[PDB]
Design an enzyme around this catalytic site. Structure first.
Site, PDB file in Angstrom:
ATOM      1  N   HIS A 406     126.989  12.448  47.607  1.00 19.60           N
ATOM      2  CA  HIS A 406     126.876  11.821  46.655  1.00 19.60           C
ATOM      3  C   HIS A 406     127.751  10.743  45.708  1.00 19.60           C
ATOM      4  CE1 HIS A 406     124.771  10.723  41.700  1.00 19.60           C
ATOM      5  NE2 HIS A 406     124.646   9.757  42.665  1.00 19.60           N
ATOM      6  N   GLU A 449     120.405  12.416  48.079  1.00 21.18           N
ATOM      7  CA  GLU A 449     121.267  11.636  47.091  1.00 21.18           C
ATOM      8  C   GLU A 449     122.566  11.556  48.850  1.00 21.18           C
ATOM      9  OE1 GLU A 449     121.809  13.382  43.699  1.00 21.18           O
ATOM     10  OE2 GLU A 449     121.159  11.682  42.713  1.00 21.18           O
ATOM     11  N   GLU A 525     111.970  14.751  42.066  1.00 18.74           N
ATOM     12  CA  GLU A 525     112.697  15.170  40.248  1.00 18.74           C
ATOM     13  C   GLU A 525     112.396  14.525  39.365  1.00 18.74           C
ATOM     14  OE1 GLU A 525     116.913  14.497  40.837  1.00 18.74           O
ATOM     15  OE2 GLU A 525     116.939  16.326  42.532  1.00 18.74           O
ATOM     16  N   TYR A 526     111.558  14.808  38.620  1.00 16.89           N
ATOM     17  CA  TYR A 526     111.069  13.993  37.068  1.00 16.89           C
ATOM     18  C   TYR A 526     111.385  15.184  35.790  1.00 16.89           C
ATOM     19  CZ  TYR A 526     106.718  17.294  36.606  1.00 16.89           C
ATOM     20  OH  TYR A 526     105.742  18.152  36.702  1.00 16.89           O
ATOM     21  N   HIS A 528     113.489  15.253  33.171  1.00 15.43           N
ATOM     22  CA  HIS A 528     114.931  15.924  33.176  1.00 15.43           C
ATOM     23  C   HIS A 528     114.911  16.793  31.645  1.00 15.43           C
ATOM     24  CE1 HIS A 528     119.385  16.113  32.811  1.00 15.43           C
ATOM     25  NE2 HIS A 528     119.560  15.425  34.186  1.00 15.43           N
ATOM     26  N   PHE A 589     126.172  18.331  31.656  1.00 16.98           N
ATOM     27  CA  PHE A 589     125.754  17.652  33.082  1.00 16.98           C
ATOM     28  C   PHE A 589     125.007  19.377  33.681  1.00 16.98           C
ATOM     29  CE2 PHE A 589     123.391  13.845  31.717  1.00 16.98           C
ATOM     30  CZ  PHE A 589     124.160  12.671  31.020  1.00 16.98           C
ATOM     31  N   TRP A 987     120.494  10.018  30.744  1.00 14.62           N
ATOM     32  CA  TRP A 987     121.307   8.968  30.691  1.00 14.62           C
ATOM     33  C   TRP A 987     121.171   7.584  30.383  1.00 14.62           C
ATOM     34  CZ3 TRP A 987     119.722  12.020  34.759  1.00 14.62           C
ATOM     35  CH2 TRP A 987     119.112  12.103  35.689  1.00 14.62           C
TER      36      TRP A 987
HETATM   37 NA    NA Z   1     122.765  18.735  36.839  1.00 20.78          NA
END
Ligand code: NA
Ligand SMILES: [Mg+2]
Ligand SMILES: [Mg+2]
Ligand SMILES: [Mg+2]
Ligand SMILES: [Mg+2]
Ligand code: NA
Ligand code: NA
Ligand code: NA
Ligand code: NA
Ligand code: NA
Ligand code: NA
Ligand code: NA
Lengths: 1011, 1011
Positions: A406, A449, A525-526, A528, A589, A987
């Protein structure tokens, strides 16, 4: 040679990857999965010494124990024992980006063990050592002699020690490097830890041995017939008297058996494999594996001689299941899946990245109890036991190669480079070679990623070639590349396009129907789940259910990645990134879980459970329609409880057995309900209860629920005329209202109710004032920092507009006497640098019953950012044990996350009305509330509220939950209106327009009295 | 570390692969492709010492020169200097098959060079060394210090020496290993040679440099518009003032230019490549590249500053062409190709596997002159100059990865093993990275005879992803696997199926239409040209022309792999496998070329030329129809010569310019031809002549020809009655016939014409006898050996039936006197151990004209293998200088290889009637002959013949051509009938049924007289 700075060298003298082995020398032990005497664990007390670099390691360490070394438990991450700081970073690399080189200062972990080997192990066969997980690279010595080298932190490294060991005492030496060129493919955002963090074992195999076996199950059109195909490979000397027997077992019943000598079919001009054989077993009416019913068989692979002498046996659990994509749908056993998934990193708050059975079972139980049926191995192959448990408990697994880059610029810099193809191939191929026999694994993933490079296309094809039984997915490069069978975006929204250049995140509904597109869509991924989140979760599930090709997704994520630290008093507190002294860091995070690090649920978990329910409900008149979303199982452990209540007062209830076939419907006619005499709203609540306990749940487990409003009787009856008449007392500074020993004081300078009295007892510590702000949630803040401000983030928009700074300017404060009441009229304006942000107009009407009716009408400037809330607040003098309310509950709920909450009468301790988010924010709100009770006070209306010992100011100013102090009295926030919380990602602004407070003019009304 | 026994280590410290660099510091030099001072050749005299193993190398060699070392020319194979024996083997490995281990006795070549480096090269920039070809692996030292390691014998290995070199005197030390784990992927059937066999060079680049560039050309629908896209990559420090200019030139005219700073388009969430830029140049009406018209542009890539200062320039030749497969057809520039291809190994009889420009140019000229348009790089990337020459002369190239594992059991053992994927990937990826800019390369190949494994599928997809401009092919695993865009079998026959298990070779016509099959079919290998071969070649070309999706193939192969050895007198002779003391060997199976090692043509080359003609002809009455098979070019260098002759006597001729569009037709009306006075057959011959010289041919080059029979006048006129009457003289042992001076003697015990006299001159040395055998061709023998007999081979069937041992038994021998003649009647039976194989019944009629009419009627037992020939033979006393015949010629031609031959009057020296095949066999036959003249003799009829100083017996008994001796007189073989030669392959019977002598009863007649 510095092999840790060379991607051309990923291993030295490492043995081939293979499925789990135990080398049983007794067939029955293999059948029953009993422990094997030939598989020894070397876990336990080891010797360890930390060094700043590999060059600092003294030569003597190879020959004997260092006196400076300590005795530590293995498996472990050495950061968890306090040797160096566990680094945490989000996007950027923890090291200097200059491939393939690592920092000269490379923390080095020197592990050693003195252990005993039986002479029988060395007199015959092969003795190997297995390291299931070493982060990130290591060299191995045995009795002072160099054995080999290994990379890839997340897969087993195996070495032949037969030529190295002596009978009796032996000594291993393991030099573990924190950083290697392997690290460039291990850029997962999590704690950067190192060491021997998975099991170490010894395995004895005979010289003539099973070296590999592959199990396949093919089916006829209606799955009533199956063929189990088992390919078995050998190593050692081929003899004509050698045989392989494969037997298949359903529990204790043998269903099939086949025997053959070695020698495969002709495959090319040079013949076939003399060292292989393929056995085919017919299975009639196979019991099919699924997450709903994890039916398992046992396959036993016996290597033996013709006369019947066993050499060795291996075995695995077999699940009869077919996974295929057809006509744009992912099918399991011919039926379209709906993935109720979650991403799960391997994390323990105390042991770091070391996994154990108890933690694993605890996770699986909690997942299944909350209606999850799938898990993504983010972002690496897991501890080998995970798959065994998923096979047996029933969960769909996405098994993911340990490849994440990433931090590369651009993201595909390594993955498009043919020079990195070898290193990447190993991370994919060795995963497949290990895990291919697990029925729970339904999808292979190429990593995470790492952009989209040519190496992805190559490895995609490799898997399709070697294992056609499982689809391959990969998100990098826009989620819909030529390297993925499934459109698998991260954080694509339901209705809203995010048209980024090169890599847009389309609306998931829109993405499906793009010109030429035909594939299924399952979000990798969804939603958050960072802090107070999962706002808008219901929007995804409505879309999943409506659209055949939207087949679900994996929530991000399961567990907060917090670690326990100890203060000056030695008390434990949850720490995130930057608390260990690591810099640059990415703060909170790492905590985006549905459960706390200790596996205590966040409020969001109940929202997930409700939306992922397996039964759907409709009401028409007196008839309840129950629809099953199960694909395979009948509802053979399900009872429907129904209850009708008038404003929380139960009037009628009953129970009806559920008898619903997969995908079927059942109509339940409710009995004649008696009409209540009293005014109010009737509410129907239904819940699905599991009467019998299971492997994953207790007796009485609630799996599904739903509510409806029934008949409402509006109150038309006038209250009896009050005998007492309230009196207005006017001074210069105050408007006072008296009724017996009760008193209401309105400060004429401020224009607010500044105090209330019952006798000599005061009720308020802080006046009742308007509030338009909340202590910012994680989603309100986004990526905005003190040094890097994001002006688009909700908190910064509020801050820049002066919302947190605005001062109430009094426009009007009058008092009038009515026939039976005193009317106080007020008007305020909140301004910031000449700009009027909000105007609040109020009336306070106090009558002989002791009731204060408050009417509020608010104006919000159209050009000011939409406010977080529109309500009132005060600090009450009272501190009471219980909170009692008629509204949505019992758990915390917000406008875009209240579907799980039910309308009823709820009574909780005050502590339950506060949510202990590690990073403190607005919390504990309960919506749709018509009555609130706290000590002597009663509030009535239609409002949202929170109630706690922490002010919005303290929550806003305190970084960690453990630094919070209970204030004097009780802070109450009563909102006419509250903004959504969002969470589509954390974000960018993610609160949907319908949950933003944009109406401009708002009205709410409250009645405050003594209960 | 023993890196040469580890497939995980293929290189150490090797630089990235890339297209040919020269680092010009002058743009005009780059445009014109003039030599670069920054690219220095290290070719010439080196020092060399041979060692039996790497352990046997003394440590002093790293620092100091060895006195025992000899001076040798580099590039070279050290077996060509006589250091050890060059091993030859076909299917079996030359080493013990135990991967990845190699023999402990591993011949080691120690190369060293002392050379000067100027300070200017080291003061700034980067100095690298380039080894274009080292077999099979090597370690490198510079001034005593270790630099790196490399594998893959057929691609350049490059190392940065910037930190290793010093101003002034420098020493390189290269330890080359004959065997490595790389050898397992290099199992080609050729001579196993070793050493530094390709160029060694030094390249100086600046620190800010062009590190890579790719050129693509895309087109609109009718190819009238093109876009040239050039991706340029850099290494070094990025600065804003940096620029890249790509300029395109057509000769001295610049047609397009584009300039840009660095910074590519956004590709993912992390942005794009800051160190890359892509320039796009529009080109209107581009001149297109093909083998027919190799139009080239020059692309010049300039790295410079914004103010105009050049840093460096690179460049390449650019051919504007599009290769795609559409609707099952391989297309170039929208037009379907017909591949007139050949396989070409890199081989020189004196220098071994070292290649030079002169040889390469010689090969290309001969190929084009013989109507080849395509070459397959069997079985590895070639010397870099090969591609340049193919770009410029115009040949379609299949570039093939250096991967062959033919000796593995099964063939895919390594290629299906993921542990061998890294090493295989490097052989594919590094070839593409080097050769991707060459327009002559139209197809990529994954290697040769390595079965089909998952590694092939992975690498197939890698190429498709990185380079969609070229189809990918691969024959392994049955020629039609998922790893090939083209069905590309080896030695699949035209009409005949070979249904081998797992990997059948279908009839090529059948293969195309198998259920579900849609792909084009181009044979990667066909028409095995071993010895007297290429029988049935016309059958392939008829099929190629009839079937759109049969698009040609590559003949096996171009050049005999013989080497030069010397005898006692220093005279050279051609040696094959086994002559160099290597065992086990595969004898003469290295010699399957259309040309000898010195590039002298075999007779088969003319058959290839004729069948691969680009013009097709039909005759209708007086009209000649000419069809062009060219796709792009008009016939602008072609004149048609026509000739009409009566039994070899020219009666009319003329010439007509050809003006034929590609794929077009031209009708040519022949003038009124006058009817001949004499009896006989009129023949029409046409030829296409190229009046102008080209880059590849001389003026007057004949490119195509064809013949037809016109009118025939049968001889009815009775010859003037002869006055002379022959007389019969009878003894017990002889029938003697006298006519004046002439005498014919028939032996009564044997039944044969034993002698003829003209005066006192004897005419025969051996009697005239029937012959049913031939000295066996390579195709007759196949893989049969003395120790390993193949009973199916034609030679073994003939031997076992007693054909070679058959003894004539006399059944009848009578003499009759006619009015004007003597009639001799004979009958013989050929028997082997009681079994009658053949019966021959003859009459000899000698009249007053001196003509002996021989009639022959033969019975062949239906259960005996069909005979090689049915003829007569004798040893003539005469040795004459010339051979003159009316029949097919001038070159050797056989029943299944006589299409290229023309019917005319031919006159050659006797030596041209013998074909010097290295392995002696039946040779020099000419078919369809009506008249033969030799010294005083004339033979008339309709026969096949050969004539030489060598008996069939000597040809059969002698192993090599250099051991043959001219026998007394001249051996004449006159056949009524001769069997086909075959050649579809050379390991199984390949003579088609229509060319086998199976009729049972045969008749032919000859006339023998004095000329
Ligand atoms: Na994280
Ligand atoms: Mg490495
Ligand atoms: Mg609801
Ligand atoms: Mg190696
Ligand atoms: Mg012809
Ligand atoms: Na769906
Ligand atoms: Na039930
Ligand atoms: Na806070
Ligand atoms: Na064709
Ligand atoms: Na050969
Ligand atoms: Na012409
Ligand atoms: Na011979």
């Amino acid at each position: 040679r510095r092999d840790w700075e060379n991607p051309g060298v990923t291993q030295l003298n490492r043995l081939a990857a293979h499925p789990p082995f135990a080398s049983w020398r007794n067939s029955e032990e293999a059948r029953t999965d009993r422990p094997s005497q030939q598989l020894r664990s070397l876990n336990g007390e080891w010797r360890f010494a930390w060094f700043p670099a590999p060059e600092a390691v003294p030569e003597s360490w190879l020959e004997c124990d260092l006196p400076e070394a300590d005795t530590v438990v293995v498996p472990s991450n050495w950061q968890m024992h306090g040797y160096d700081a566990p680094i945490y970073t989000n996007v950027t690399y923890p090291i200097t980006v200059n491939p393939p080189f690592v920092p000269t200062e490379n923390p080095t972990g020197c592990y050693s063990l003195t252990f005993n080997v039986d002479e029988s192990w060395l007199q015959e066969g092969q003795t190997r050592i297995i390291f299931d997980g070493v982060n990130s690279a290591f060299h191995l010595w045995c009795n002072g002699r160099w054995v080999g080298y290994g990379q890839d932190s997340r897969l087993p490294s195996e070495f032949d020690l037969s030529a190295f060991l002596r009978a009796g005492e032996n000594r291993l030496a393991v030099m573990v490097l924190r950083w290697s060129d392997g690290s460039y493919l291990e850029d997962q955002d999590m704690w950067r830890m190192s060491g021997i963090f998975r099991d170490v074992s010894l395995l004895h195999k005979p010289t003539t041995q099973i070296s590999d076996f592959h199990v396949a199950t093919r089916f006829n059109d209606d799955f009533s017939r199956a063929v189990l195909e088992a390919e078995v490979q050998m190593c050692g000397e081929l003899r004509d008297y050698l045989r392989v027997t494969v037997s298949l077992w359903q529990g204790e019943t043998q269903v099939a058996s086949g025997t053959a000598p070695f020698g495969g079919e002709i495959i090319d001009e040079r013949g076939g494999y003399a060292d292989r054989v393929t056995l085919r077993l017919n299975v009639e009416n196979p019991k099919l594996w699924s997450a709903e019913i994890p039916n398992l068989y046992r396959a036993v692979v016996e290597l033996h001689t013709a006369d019947g002498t066993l050499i060795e046996a291996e075995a695995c659990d077999v699940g009869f299941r077919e996974v295929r994509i057809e006509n744009g749908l992912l099918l399991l056993n011919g039926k379209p899946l709906l993935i109720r998934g979650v991403n799960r990193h391997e994390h323990h708050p105390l042991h770091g990245q070391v996994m154990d059975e108890q933690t694993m079972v605890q996770d699986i139980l909690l997942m299944k109890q909350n209606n999850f049926n799938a898990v993504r191995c983010s972002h690496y192959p897991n501890h080998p036991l995970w798959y065994t448990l998923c096979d047996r408990y029933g969960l769909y697994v996405v098994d993911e190669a340990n490849i994440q880059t990433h931090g590369m610029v651009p993201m595909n810099r390594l993955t498009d480079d043919p020079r990195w193809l070898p290193a990447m191939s190993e991370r994919v191929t060795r995963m497949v070679q290990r895990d291919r026999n697990h029925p729970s694994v339904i999808i292979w993933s190429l990593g995470n990623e790492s952009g989209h490079g040519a190496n992805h296309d190559a490895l995609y094809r490799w898997i399709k070639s070697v294992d056609p039984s499982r689809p391959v997915q990969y998100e990098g490069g826009g989620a819909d590349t030529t390297a993925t069978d499934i459109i698998c975006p991260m954080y694509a929204r339901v209705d809203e396009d995010q048209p980024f250049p090169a890599v847009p995140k389309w609306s998931i509904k829109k993405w499906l129907s793009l010109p030429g597109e035909t594939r299924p869509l399952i979000l990798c991924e969804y939603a958050h789940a960072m802090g107070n989140s999962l706002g808008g979760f219901a929007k995804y599930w409505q879309a999943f259910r409506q659209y055949p090709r939207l087949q679900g997704g994996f929530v991000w994520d399961w567990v907060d990645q917090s670690l326990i630290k100890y203060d000056e008093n030695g008390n434990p507190w949850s720490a995130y990134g930057g608390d260990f002294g690591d810099t640059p860091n990415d703060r909170q995070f790492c905590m985006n879980g549905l459960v706390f690090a200790d596996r205590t649920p966040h409020p969001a978990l109940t929202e997930a459970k409700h939306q992922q329910q397996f039964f759907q409900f409709r009401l028409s008149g007196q008839t309840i329609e129950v629809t099953s979303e199960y694909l395979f199982r009948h509802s053979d452990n399900e009872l429907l409880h129904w209850m009708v209540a008038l404003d929380g007062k139960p009037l009628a209830s009953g129970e009806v057995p559920l008898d619903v076939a997969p995908q079927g419907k059942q109509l339940i006619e409710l009995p004649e309900l008696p009409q209540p005499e009293s005014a109010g709203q009737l509410w129907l609540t239904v819940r699905v209860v599991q009467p019998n306990a299971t492997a994953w749940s207790e007796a009485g487990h609630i799996s599904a629920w739903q509510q409806w409003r029934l008949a409402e009787n509006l109150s038309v009856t006038l209250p009896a005329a009050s005998h007492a008449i309230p009196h207005l007392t006017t001074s210069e500074m105050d408007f006072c209202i008296e009724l017996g020993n009760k008193r209401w004081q309105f400060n004429r300078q401020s224009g607010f109710l500044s105090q209330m009295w019952i006798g000599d007892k005061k009720q308020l510590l802080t006046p009742l004032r308007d509030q338009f702000t909340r202590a910012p949630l994680d989603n309100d803040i986004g990526v905005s920092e003190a040094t890097r401000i994001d002006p688009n983030a909700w908190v910064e928009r509020w801050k820049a507009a002066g919302h947190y700074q605005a001062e109430a300017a009094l426009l009007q404060c009058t008092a009038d006497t009515l026939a039976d009441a005193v009317l106080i009229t007020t008007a305020h304006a909140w301004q910031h640098q000449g700009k009027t942000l909000f105007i609040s107009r109020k009336t306070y009407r106090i009558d002989g019953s002791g009731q204060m009716a408050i009417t509020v009408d608010v104006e919000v400037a159209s050009d000011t950012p939409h406010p977080a809330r529109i309500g009132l607040n005060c600090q009450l003098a009272q501190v009471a044990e219980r909170v009692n309310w008629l509204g949505l509950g019992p758990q915390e709920n917000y406008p875009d996350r209240l579907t799980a909450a039910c309308f009823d009468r709820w009574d909780l301790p005050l502590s339950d009305m506060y949510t202990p988010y590690v990073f403190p924010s607005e919390n504990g709100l309960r919506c749709g509330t018509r009555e609130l009770n706290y000590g002597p006070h009663q509030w009535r209306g239609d409002f949202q509220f929170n109630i706690s010992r922490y002010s919005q100011q303290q929550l806003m100013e305190t970084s960690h939950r453990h630094l919070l102090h209970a204030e004097e009295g009780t802070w109450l926030n009563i909102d006419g209106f509250h903004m959504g919380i969002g969470g589509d990602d954390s974000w960018s602004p993610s609160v949907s327009a319908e949950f933003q407070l944009s109406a401009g003019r708002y009205h709410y009304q409250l009645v405050w009295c003594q209960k």
